[PDB]
Ligand binder design. Structure first.
Ligand SMILES: [Ca+2]
Length: 273
């Protein structure tokens, strides 16, 4: 088969030495890499920029004529990644080289046969501050019709987190937007945890960290990200090959999803970043 689906809750991706490089989520589709040797026990595969090996035990072959395979498609305005049959995210602007309504296939979401994507937020150094002020970040809730969010009017706590910990506030807003549904998840409301901290794939809600209030959740999650990711040399969102996505989340498109939110906010606030 050309495509394989991850069967267990998560599965490891290994190098040729058998060392763990990362892990990916149940349902993830990986591409068979025909330039490298596969055997009975391990397949050479690619996923979200990472070229390695997976145990055949963890995979199920798909048939692309009847099973969903992730793909990218232009509407003539934005290029979308279909990350699941019924969910698309906008990743870039339409390039004149894209045929409208044609499905395109890419292992990194950057290199395609007939064009290449800049996804600048995906690789943007997150220690650089946003050019958006507290008031500009706060205007995004109306501009995107975000209702009943615990993060409404917290632009000032985000810019404080950015001032004190040197982490990009537009990135902190986008990450909390994705992980907690803009501060509307049960974890968001119960534990002021907006970033999915220690919310492990095996038991996400049980292992989720508790913060005392919304402001301490923003500042406390920022301190955690700084100490566990930024300070250990994970300084951009990235994918399964590099950046925070190697270890932060099983979802191979976690970084792409956060970049997509940064892109949408940036566009609605006037393009200052
Ligand atoms: Ca090695």
């Amino acid at each position: 088969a050309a495509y394989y689906q991850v069967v267990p809750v998560t599965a490891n991706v290994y190098d040729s030495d058998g060392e763990k490089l990362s892990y990916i989520s149940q349902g993830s589709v990986v591409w068979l890499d025909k330039d490298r040797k596969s055997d009975d026990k391990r397949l050479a595969i690619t996923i979200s920029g990472l070229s390695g090996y997976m145990k055949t035990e963890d995979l199920q072959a798909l048939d692309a004529s009847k099973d969903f395979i992730p793909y990218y498609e232009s509407d003539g305005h934005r290029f979308y990644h279909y990350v699941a049959q019924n969910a698309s995210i906008p990743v870039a602007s339409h390039l004149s080289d894209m045929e409208v309504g044609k499905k395109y296939y890419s292992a990194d979401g950057l290199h395609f046969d007939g064009f290449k994507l800049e996804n600048p937020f995906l690789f943007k150094d997150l220690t650089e501050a946003t050019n958006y002020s507290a008031e500009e970040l706060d205007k995004v809730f109306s501009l995107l019709n975000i209702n009943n969010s615990l993060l409404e009017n917290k632009g000032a706590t985000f810019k404080e987190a950015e001032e004190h910990y040197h982490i990009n506030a537009l990135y902190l807003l986008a990450h909390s937007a994705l992980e907690s549904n803009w501060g509307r998840s049960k974890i968001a409301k119960d534990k002021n945890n907006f970033f999915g901290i220690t919310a492990y794939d095996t038991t996400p809600y049980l292992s989720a960290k508790t913060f005392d209030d919304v402001d301490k959740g923003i500042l406390g999650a920022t301190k955690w990200i700084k100490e566990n990711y930024i300070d250990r040399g994970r300084t951009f969102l990235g994918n399964k090959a590099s950046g925070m996505n190697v270890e932060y989340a099983s979802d191979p498109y976690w970084g792409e999803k956060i970049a997509s939110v940064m892109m949408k906010i940036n566009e609605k606030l006037g393009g200052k970043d």
